[PDB]
Amino acid sequence: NKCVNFNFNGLTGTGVLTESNKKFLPFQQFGRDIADTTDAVRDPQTLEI
Amino acid sequence: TLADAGFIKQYGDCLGDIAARDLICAQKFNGLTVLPPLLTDEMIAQYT
Amino acid sequence: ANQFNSAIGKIQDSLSSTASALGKLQNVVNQNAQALNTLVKQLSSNFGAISSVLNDILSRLDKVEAEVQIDRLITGRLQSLQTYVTQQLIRAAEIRA
Amino acid sequence: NATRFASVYAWNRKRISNCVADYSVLYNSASFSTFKCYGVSPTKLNDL
Amino acid sequence: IDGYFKIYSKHTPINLVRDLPQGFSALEPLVDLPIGINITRFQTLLAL
Ligand SMILES: *[C@@H]1O[C@H](CO)[C@@H](O)[C@H](O)[C@H]1NC(C)=O
Numbered sequence: 021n022k023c024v025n026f027n028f029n030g031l032t033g034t035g036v037l038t039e040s041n042k043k044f045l046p047f048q049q050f051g052r053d054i055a056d057t058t059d060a061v062r063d064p065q066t067l068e069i
Numbered sequence: 070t071l072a073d074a075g076f077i078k079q080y081g082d083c084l085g086d087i088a089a090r091d092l093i094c095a096q097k098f099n100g101l102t103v104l105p106p107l108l109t110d111e112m113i114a115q116y117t
Numbered sequence: 118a119n120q121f122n123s124a125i126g127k128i129q130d131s132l133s134s135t136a137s138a139l140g141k142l143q144n145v146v147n148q149n150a151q152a153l154n155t156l157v158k159q160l161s162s163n164f165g166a167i168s169s170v171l172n173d174i175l176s177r178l179d180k181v182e183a184e185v186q187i188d189r190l191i192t193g194r195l196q197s198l199q200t201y202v203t204q205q206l207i208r209a210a211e212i213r214a
Numbered sequence: 215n216a217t218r219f220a221s222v223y224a225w226n227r228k229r230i231s232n233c234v235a236d237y238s239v240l241y242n243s244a245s246f247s248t249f250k251c252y253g254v255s256p257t258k259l260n261d262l
Numbered sequence: 263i264d265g266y267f268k269i270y271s272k273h274t275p276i277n278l279v280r281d282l283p284q285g286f287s288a289l290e291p292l293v294d295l296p297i298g299i300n301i302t303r304f305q306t307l308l309a310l
């Protein structure tokens with residue numbers, strides 16, 4: 021809920037992280053928007069989205 | 070059917086689901102903006 | 118009067134029933150939308166850089182090995198804007214007319 | 215530091231997984247002539 | 263693909279006697295393993 025310089029696994033960017041309702045299936049790690057920009061990620065330590 | 074009119078995209082919708090289904094949040098997020106016409110759809114109806 | 122009141126009646130019925138009546142206006146909204154969707158789609162291109170993502174260059178290469186990759190993305194994205202702004206400038210003249 | 219390597223003709227492969235890589239160990243060694251890379255820059259390898 | 267082999271799969275109940283069903287569904291991944299071999303040929307396995 022705060023603006024941050026995130027890195028997940030090397031996927032460096034800048035954003036406000038927020039809790040997702042997107043139903044990622046067990047195999048998935050990133051989710052992308054029409055522009056081919058990531059807009060969701062499963063956290064590598066605690067697997068919430 | 071309108072691809073937005075530049076009105077009030079205050080992240081109440083553009084954070085969450087509609088940011089995934091609507092093209093216009095992706096356009097916004099890539100630095101492309103749509104701006105309102107000076108005269109509202111009420112003011113053109115008044116001149117008419 | 119009765120012929121006028123009937124004809125204004127058919128204007129409602131025509132606009133209400135047919136799909137095509139406002140096609141000249143829908144085609145402007147469609148061309149404005151298509152070009153913005155294309156200008157966004159262009160961002161996904163490599164242009165010959167190792168990634169379409171600006172951060173995936175800056176997080177894999179040093180401050181010299183990146184500049185050539187980044188200049189490819191600048192050249193490609195800038196020519197994408199010059200295309201869009203040419204289309205919209207030319208299009209503007211059609212709407213002005 | 216394998217005792218004896220394979221021949222270039224029969225070249226060996228190892229899958230390295232589920233472990234931490236510290237390439238700065240390799241890069242901080244004086245031992246190598248050659249440490250040349252083709253899709254990453256070696257000092258960034260540790261950030262990834 | 264390129265030094266991996268992987269399996270995608272799905273289960274659905276249906277009531278068709280001897281024909282593959284009209285409809286649509288997509289197979290999720292179930293495993294990947296890096297066997298890295300020259301495959302050409304295959305056979306199925308079953309029990310009495
Ligand atoms: C590593 O992450 C798991 C959850 O995936 C957590 O339960 C565990 O406590 C972490 N490891 C250590 C050493 O704490």
Ligand SMILES: *[C@@H]1O[C@H](CO)[C@@H](O)[C@H](O)[C@H]1NC(C)=O
Pocket residue numbers: 300302
């Ligand atoms: C795999 O083996 C077959 C049979 O000897 C041979 O025809 C084929 O060229 C080989 N392909 C590869 C990629 O080794």
